[PDB]
From Swiss-Prot, chain A:
Quaternary data: Component of the 19S proteasome regulatory particle complex. The 26S proteasome consists of a 20S core particle (CP) and two 19S regulatory subunits (RP). The regulatory particle is made of a lid composed of 9 subunits, a base containing 6 ATPases including PSMC5 and few additional components. Component of a complex with USP49 and RUVBL1. Interacts with PRPF19. Interacts with TRIM5. Interacts with NDC80. Interacts with PAAF1. Interacts, in vitro, with the thyroid hormone receptor (in a thyroid hormone T3-dependent manner) and with retinoid X receptor (RXR). Interacts with ERCC6.
Annotated disulfide bonds: none
Function: Component of the 26S proteasome, a multiprotein complex involved in the ATP-dependent degradation of ubiquitinated proteins. This complex plays a key role in the maintenance of protein homeostasis by removing misfolded or damaged proteins, which could impair cellular functions, and by removing proteins whose functions are no longer required. Therefore, the proteasome participates in numerous cellular processes, including cell cycle progression, apoptosis, or DNA damage repair.
Family membership noted in the UniProt record: Belongs to the AAA ATPase family.
Subcellular localization(s) per the UniProt record: Cytoplasm; Nucleus
Organism: Homo sapiens
Coiled coil ranges: none
Domain of life: Eukaryota
Protein name: 26S proteasome regulatory subunit 8
Full-protein residues shown: 357 to 406 of 406
Swiss-Prot record, chain E:
Residue window of the full protein shown: 350 to 418 of 418
N6-acetyllysine modified-residue sites: 48, 52
Physiological role: Component of the 26S proteasome, a multiprotein complex involved in the ATP-dependent degradation of ubiquitinated proteins. This complex plays a key role in the maintenance of protein homeostasis by removing misfolded or damaged proteins, which could impair cellular functions, and by removing proteins whose functions are no longer required. Therefore, the proteasome participates in numerous cellular processes, including cell cycle progression, apoptosis, or DNA damage repair.
Family to which this protein belongs: Belongs to the AAA ATPase family.
Cellular location(s): Cytoplasm; Nucleus
Organism annotation: Homo sapiens
Disulfide bridges in this chain: none
Protein name: 26S proteasome regulatory subunit 6B
Subunit and interaction comment: Component of the 19S proteasome regulatory particle complex. The 26S proteasome consists of a 20S core particle (CP) and two 19S regulatory subunits (RP). The regulatory particle is made of a lid composed of 9 subunits, a base containing 6 ATPases including PSMC4 and few additional components. Interacts with NR1I3. Interacts with PAAF1. Interacts with TRIM5. Interacts with ZFAND1.
Swiss-Prot record, chain G:
GO BP of this protein: proteasome-mediated ubiquitin-dependent protein catabolic process; response to virus
Effect of residue 107 to V: In a colorectal cancer sample; somatic mutation
Induction: Down-regulated by antioxidants BO-653 and probucol. Down-regulated in response to enterovirus 71 (EV71) infection (at protein level).
Listed InterPro entries: Ntn_hydrolases_N, Proteasome_alpha, Proteasome_alpha-type, Proteasome_asu_N, Proteasome_sua/b
Chain positions found as Phosphoserine: 4, 11, 13
Known partners and oligomeric status: The 26S proteasome consists of a 20S proteasome core and two 19S regulatory subunits. The 20S proteasome core is a barrel-shaped complex made of 28 subunits that are arranged in four stacked rings. The two outer rings are each formed by seven alpha subunits, and the two inner rings are formed by seven beta subunits. The proteolytic activity is exerted by three beta-subunits PSMB5, PSMB6 and PSMB7.
Organism phylogeny: Eukaryota, Metazoa, Chordata, Craniata, Vertebrata
Job of this protein: Component of the 20S core proteasome complex involved in the proteolytic degradation of most intracellular proteins. This complex plays numerous essential roles within the cell by associating with different regulatory particles. Associated with two 19S regulatory particles, forms the 26S proteasome and thus participates in the ATP-dependent degradation of ubiquitinated proteins.
Name of the protein in question: Proteasome subunit alpha type-2
Residue numbers of N6-acetyllysine PTMs: 67, 168
Gene responsible for this protein: PSMA2
UniProtKB/Swiss-Prot annotation, chain H:
Modification Phosphoserine, positions: 12, 74, 172
Annotated protein name in UniProt: Proteasome subunit alpha type-4
Residues annotated as signal peptide: none
PTM sites of type N6-acetyllysine: 126, 175
GO terms under cellular component: cytoplasm; cytosol; extracellular exosome; intracellular membrane-bounded organelle; nucleoplasm; nucleus; P-body; proteasome complex
Organism: Homo sapiens (Human)
InterPro entries noted in UniProt: Ntn_hydrolases_N, Proteasome_alpha, Proteasome_alpha-type, Proteasome_asu_N, Proteasome_bsu_CS, Proteasome_sua/b
Entry keyword set: Acetylation, Cytoplasm, Host-virus interaction, Nucleus, Phosphoprotein, Proteasome
Pfam families: Proteasome (PF00227), Proteasome_A_N (PF10584)
BP GO annotations: proteasome-mediated ubiquitin-dependent protein catabolic process
Domain of life: Eukaryota
Induction statement: Down-regulated by antioxidants BO-653 and probucol.
Localization per Swiss-Prot or TrEMBL: Cytoplasm; Nucleus
Functional summary from the UniProt entry: Component of the 20S core proteasome complex involved in the proteolytic degradation of most intracellular proteins. This complex plays numerous essential roles within the cell by associating with different regulatory particles. Associated with two 19S regulatory particles, forms the 26S proteasome and thus participates in the ATP-dependent degradation of ubiquitinated proteins.
Length: 50, 239, 240, 100, 69, 173, 229, 247
């Protein structure tokens, strides 16, 4: 799921920059966003358990 | 299952085993004790469960020491055990220090002994309340009461048993701080008759004891003649 | 959060989260009495003030007291279950006397609080007996440390303090005192009594009369623990 | 409970000594009382009570008077009423919960 | 930005506080500060009012006992 | 002589602060030379505190007296002698800033890369973001725009995961 | 009389849940740190009081055991006092017999045996406390940890308490074999700073060191001293 | 109190000691310990379960304990409980030496400890020692020996055995590739490396997760050694080469 989502996020970042091609920096930012939000969800679940 | 031992607190911080012990004390017949200027007077509503019992059977007034009295309510067997403990404490004090135990000290020692039975699951709380009274020239009249939880306080007039609340209301009107033992004995008899319920219980016998200057500081049973006068006064008052 | 496994709620054994529910209930039992106490440390004095409720005229108010004299120079105030507090007071007196007999000098307040805390800690570890549901506050003058105020609780925690409360309104009193303590000194005079009485009067909204509170003090000039008489208490009350 | 829907959480707790005295005065005003009435004793005996219990104190005092066949209430009746309601209170669990 | 907010009020001290609060909580803090101002009959909001409003609206939960930690 | 040493360290601190406020850069430098042997009479922590504080006071004002580089190198040598790697790193970053200020572009890049390697081997987020923005600034000065942009994006991603002080956030923007 | 049966019993899968929960209490405790430098050891802890009223100097967390051994904890305070008293008692018993300060390893072993006894004895629960012990014997520094279960480990650097996972991950990245006690103290303070949630002051933390001179708790003057850098 | 008692020393409906069964299941997870008996020595190979960049190296071993001049043991289970039993083993062996002025035979030492464990499972109301041990030693009665013990207090002598994690696979391999009566200390060491290599599925032999101790007789005196890093790595490299040459 994370690998699928990072691709779409990189595409959207390329869209915002307004170019028809995805970039390595776009992929880096996409991973930084998706993995961080997944970690946020995990820690939220941990707090709910607490 | 938070009320099955005295070594567990309830969620709100209550020892239910101790509370149940007090509940047992609340089913006994009332017993009152009034402090006055001269000394202390005790009174007990002894119900006659059967006509086959001898007068004076199951006496609820004890002499823990030659100058200290004791009235009890609740489980009689536990009360007698505490009276033996009080006698032991009084006797040990005299042997070690060489003079009569002060009533305040005696109440403290017995209260701590009672309190030690509300901390472990290996024993159960005493299901009885009692009151200690004494008089000495140096210390004057003194009256104390101890509950199952092990709490001891000084009182001017105390009640324990079924009709505790009604007795407390009657005791409030006596103005005992400036009265003598001779007049208080009649008042103690009057209160017991009023609180008693003739409709529910069949009959009762009034037991009286006192300690003060008139007795020279020795707790003893009230004389038969005085008891007869007090009973007649109480009956006459109940017009 | 509040998971249970076995008898963790019935004896002093760890809950799944690492909790001692029985200890927590002992804290909850301290509020059964319905009373509150306050202890404040001054520049050269220590003061303890607590409520005094006589439910009816029949009670002998003289015997109803929560202030006790552990030794000549140490006094304490207790809150919570009545019977439990008296038993702990007796133990403190014995421990203080034993210290004097063994080492040849009076027991420091911190050491006395430590000894009582150690005794309490045994109750929360062993499952045979429940923890005493009462709290103690000790005040005394140290030889080279000035006034001392200490408090020990059912668990065995015994931190020192500058101002403290205990009972039903411990939270409100703690906030009130912290605000006062923050401003300048939490009082720096023998009228530290006024700060305490005001703190107690503020939280409970009582407007005490002379026969509704008891005060005990120790001062550097007069280290002996004393219980102020109803007359002296009234004098402080009128002044404030 | 969000502070956009229920902005203020007002706490109506059990009455203090002064609150008990005021409630007792309010609910005992209309009674025909003979003799001095010392509300302070009733307040001291009515610890842990609520407004309904303080009203029931007056009601039970009036009931005691009616039983005695009197056209007025007395301090003894008030004391009996407070003791009665205090005994009745044992059947209720005294505990409060907070918005947490 | 819409209130009066006397100069003595430093919102940075309240921002720095480590309390987990929502935008509704912040709006309620401001609203209660204004309510206290109105109650005292002032058209200017003071730091005292802001402090009291924060205490009222960010009420702390029951404190965990200290024998842990 | 503990009381005398405490008085003397307080006096040097105050005198250096006053010299910094007044602007006597030569006097401040001479004072920093004078305090060279005072290292052995104060705690290592307080020796470092005094050195760092006096360096910061001197560098706060912008007199290009010409001794900035030499004095920073001397401070770095002291830090390496006393094994205070963290002090070394902070002063090395400030040295990078001074080198950029003093129109020294190509040289500073190698040491900036050295410190962006050491800090990333470590995880000092603050100095990492500061040095990353400084290297982006020097790349912009060299006119290597896409590399400067990449460096700036890395600085942003590093800053997104740390509470940037107002000063740091403002320089980032 | 006292229960004679063990309250700690094996679970179906072979775990001692009571020991597991004692570690959970330790985990939720206050953070602690210990670093073994090249020429000394340092122990540090957070001492965040609940309010201004508490006296910071009233009770110490870094308590000495002998002239060359000191220890700190993460968990319940009352249980720490019991172990500190037993540790001092054991150290003196050793000295009385052997006329030599107890080596750090020996003291840890004896203290550990005491904690083990409470996982098997009757009518007791495990010590919900983890100890860090530092020492200097035979011209060498020592750092040990001792858990509720009674097991002990030798560490070059470690942390306990809340967010100890991040504390250990932090220490691994920053540790170095040839560190100096000053750099060890600086790293120890920073490790605590990682998860502190507030401003760290000389009254909000506690530090102690051990070296050839001997173990001694740093004064608040020095603790503020180090904090400034 | 009866209500809170766990009843740790009773029988199950099918005649089973559940507390002993659970304790053995606890040992099933601990670090793997391996013992091989050779013609001219014995060896113990144990998986060093603790592995962290920050742990320091103290003492001469982590799981191998010396009990006498001619005995040693390894443990698998609760570490704290093991320390209690290792101390008792040292006391028992010295008490025998005091009584007879001769070193305790290995079999007697194992029996004495196993008697202590058996008592815990029969009476007392306490939990059993969740530990299983392997002993290696030499005596004038039976020469080199290797023994195993369980929490139940049962023991037996072995020529090669394993306890701990993946014991089933380890014993299955040892059974297949053990040449009874014709194994030297060198083939025994190689066999230990091969067994450990497959038993520890996580990663491979790094020469840091393995502790090996060997017992031999030299000049009429027993010698107990813990192999150093250089020689342990050398053994692993040789095992890697042989595995390569086979393929």
């Amino acid at each position: 799921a994370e690998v699928k989502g990072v691709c779409t996020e990189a595409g959207m970042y390329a869209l915002r920059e307004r170019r028809v091609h995805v970039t390595q920096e776009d992929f880096e930012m996409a991973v930084a966003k998706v993995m961080q939000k997944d970690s946020e969800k995990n820690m939220s679940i941990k707090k709910l358990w607490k | 299952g938070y009320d099955l031992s005295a070594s567990t607190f309830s969620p709100d911080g209550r020892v239910f085993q101790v509370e149940y012990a007090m509940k047992a004390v609340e089913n006994s017949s009332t017993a009152i004790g009034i402090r006055c200027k001269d000394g202390v007077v005790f009174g007990v509503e002894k119900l006659v469960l059967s006509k086959l019992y001898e007068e004076g059977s199951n006496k609820r007034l004890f002499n823990v020491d030659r100058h200290v009295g004791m009235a009890v309510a609740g489980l009689l067997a536990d009360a007698r055990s505490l009276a033996d403990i009080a006698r032991e404490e009084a006797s040990n004090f005299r042997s070690n220090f060489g003079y009569n135990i002060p009533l305040k000290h005696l109440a403290d020692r017995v209260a701590m002994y009672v309190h030690a039975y509300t901390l472990y699951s290996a024993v159960r709380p005493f299901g009885c309340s009692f009151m200690l009274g004494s008089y000495s020239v140096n210390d004057g009249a003194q009256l104390y009461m101890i509950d199952p939880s092990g709490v001891s306080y000084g009182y001017w007039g105390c009640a324990i048993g079924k009709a505790r609340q009604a007795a407390k209301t009657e005791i409030e009107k006596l103005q005992m701080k400036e009265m003598t033992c001779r007049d208080i004995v009649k008042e103690v008899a009057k209160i017991i008759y009023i609180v008693h319920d003739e409709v529910k219980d069949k009959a009762f016998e009034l037991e009286l004891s006192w300690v003060g200057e008139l007795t020279n500081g020795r707790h003893e049973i009230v004389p038969k003649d005085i008891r007869e006068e007090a009973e007649k006064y109480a009956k006459e008052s109940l017009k | 959060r509040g998971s249970s496994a076995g008898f963790d709620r019935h004896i002093t054994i760890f809950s799944p989260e690492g909790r001692l529910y029985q200890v927590e209930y002992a804290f909850k039992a301290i509020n059964q009495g319905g009373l509150t106490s306050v202890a404040v440390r001054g520049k050269d004095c220590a003061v303890i003030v607590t409520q005094k409720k006589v439910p009816d005229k029949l009670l002998d108010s003289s015997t109803v007291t929560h202030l006790f004299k552990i030794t000549e120079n140490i006094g304490c105030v207790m809150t919570g279950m009545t019977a439990d507090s008296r038993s702990q007071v007796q133990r403190a007196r014995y421990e203080a006397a034993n210290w004097k007999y063994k080492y040849g000098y009076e027991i420091p307040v911190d050491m006395l609080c430590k000894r009582i805390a150690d005794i309490s800690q045994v109750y929360t570890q062993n499952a045979e007996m429940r923890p005493l549901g009462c709290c103690m506050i000790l005040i005394g003058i140290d030889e080279e440390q000035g006034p001392q105020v200490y408090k020990c609780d059912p668990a065995g925690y015994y931190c020192g303090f500058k101002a403290t409360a205990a009972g039903v309104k411990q939270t409100e009193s703690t906030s009130f005192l912290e605000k006062k303590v923050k401003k300048k000194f939490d009082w720096t005079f023998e009228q530290t009594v006024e700060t305490a009485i005001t703190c107690l009067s503020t939280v409970l909204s009582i407007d005490f009369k002379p026969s509704e509170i008891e005060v005990g003090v120790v001062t550097v000039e007069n280290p002996k623990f004393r219980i102020l008489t109803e007359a002296e208490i009234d004098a402080h009350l009128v002044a404030l | 409970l969000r502070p956009g829907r229920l902005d203020r959480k007002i706490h109506i707790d059990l009455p203090n000594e002064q609150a008990r005295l005021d409630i007792l005065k309010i609910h005992a005003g209309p009674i025909t009382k003979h003799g001095e009435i010392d509300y302070e004793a009733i307040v001291k005996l009515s610890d842990g009570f609520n407004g309904a219990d303080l009203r029931n104190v007056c009601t039970e005092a009036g009931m005691f008077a009616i039983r005695a066949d009197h056209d007025f209430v007395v301090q003894e009746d008030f004391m009996k009423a407070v003791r009665k309601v205090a005994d009745s209170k044992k059947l209720e669990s005294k505990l409060d919960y907070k918005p947490v | 930005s819409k209130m009066n907010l006397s100069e003595e009020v430093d919102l940075e001290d309240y921002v720095a506080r480590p309390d987990k609060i929502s935008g509704a909580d912040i709006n309620s803090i401001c609203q209660e500060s204004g309510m206290l101002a109105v109650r005292e009959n002032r058209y200017i909001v003071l730091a005292k009012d802001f402090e009291k409003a924060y205490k009222t609206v960010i009420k702390k939960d029951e404190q965990e006992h200290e024998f842990y930690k | 002589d503990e009381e005398a040493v405490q008085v003397k360290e307080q006096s040097i601190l105050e005198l250096g602060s006053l010299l910094a406020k007044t602007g006597q850069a030569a006097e401040l430098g001479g004072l920093l030379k004078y305090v060279r042997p005072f290292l052995n009479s104060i705690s290592k922590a307080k020796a470092a505190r005094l050195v760092r504080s006096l360096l910061d006071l001197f560098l706060d004002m912008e007199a290009a007296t010409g001794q900035e580089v030499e004095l920073c190198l001397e401070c770095i040598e002291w830090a390496k002698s006393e094994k205070r790697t963290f002090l070394r790193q902070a002063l090395e970053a400030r040295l990078v800033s001074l080198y950029f200020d003093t129109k020294r572009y190509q040289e500073a890049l190698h040491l900036g890369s050295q410190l962006l390697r050491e800090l990333k081997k470590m995880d000092d987020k603050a100095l990492l973001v500061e040095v990353q923005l400084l290297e982006s600034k020097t790349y912009h000065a060299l006119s290597n725009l896409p590399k400067a942009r990449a460096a700036l994006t890395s600085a942003r991603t590093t800053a997104n995961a740390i509470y940037c002080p107002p000063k740091l956030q403002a320089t980032l923007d | 009389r006292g229960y004679s049966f063990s309250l700690t019993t094996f679970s179906p899968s072979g775990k001692l849940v009571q020991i597991e929960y004692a570690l959970a209490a330790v985990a939720g405790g206050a953070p602690s740190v210990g670093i073994k430098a090249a020429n000394g050891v340092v122990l540090a802890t957070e001492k965040k009081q609940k309010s201004i009223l508490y006296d910071e100097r009233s009770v110490h967390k870094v308590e000495p055991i002998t002239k060359h051994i000191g220890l700190v904890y993460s968990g319940m305070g009352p249980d720490y006092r019991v172990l500190v008293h037993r540790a001092r008692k054991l150290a003196q018993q050793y000295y009385l017999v052997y006329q030599e300060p107890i080596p750090t390893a020996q003291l840890v072993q004896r203290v550990a045996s005491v904690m083990q006894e409470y996982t098997q004895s009757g009518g007791v629960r495990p010590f919900g406390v983890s100890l860090l012990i530092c020492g200097w014997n035979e011209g060498r520094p020592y750092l040990f940890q001792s858990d509720p279960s009674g097991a002990y480990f030798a560490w070059k650097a470690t942390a306990m308490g809340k967010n100890y996972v991040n504390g250990k991950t932090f220490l691994e990245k920053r540790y170095n074999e040839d560190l100096e006690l000053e750099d060890a103290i600086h790293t120890a303070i920073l490790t605590l700073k990682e998860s502190f949630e507030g401003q760290m002051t000389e009254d909000n933390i506690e530090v102690g060191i051990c070296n050839e001179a001997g173990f001694r708790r740093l004064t608040p003057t020095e603790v503020k001293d180090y904090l400034a850098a | 109190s009866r209500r809170y008692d766990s009843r740790t020393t009773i029988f199950s409906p099918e005649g089973r000691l559940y507390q002993v069964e659970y304790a053995m299941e606890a040992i099933g997870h601990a670090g793997t310990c391996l013992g091989i008996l050779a013609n001219d020595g014995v060896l113990l190979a144990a998986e060093r379960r603790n592995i962290h960049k920050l742990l320091d190296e103290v003492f001469f071993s982590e799981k191998i304990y010396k009990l006498n001049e001619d005995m040693a043991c390894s443990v698998a289970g609760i570490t704290s409980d093991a320390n209690v039993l290792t101390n008792e083993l040292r006391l028992i062996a010295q008490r025998y030496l005091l009584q007879y002025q001769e070193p305790i035979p290995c079999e007697q030492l194992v029996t004495a400890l196993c008697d202590i464990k058996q008592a815990y499972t029969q009476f007392g109301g306490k939990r059993p020692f969740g530990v299983s041990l392997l002993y290696i030693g030499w005596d004038k009665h039976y020469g080199f020996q290797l023994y195993q013990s369980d929490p139940s207090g049962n023991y037996g002598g072995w020529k090669a055995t394993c306890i701990g994690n993946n014991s089933a696979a380890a014993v299955s391999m040892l059974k297949q590739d053990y040449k009874e009566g014709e194994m030297t200390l060198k083939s025994a060491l190689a066999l230990a490396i091969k067994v450990l290599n497959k038993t520890m599925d996580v990663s491979k032999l790094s020469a840091e997760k393995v502790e090996i101790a060997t017992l031999t007789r030299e000049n009429g005196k027993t010698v107990i050694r813990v192999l150093k890093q250089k020689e342990v790595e050398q053994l692993i490299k040789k095992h890697e080469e042989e595995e390569a040459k086979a393929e």
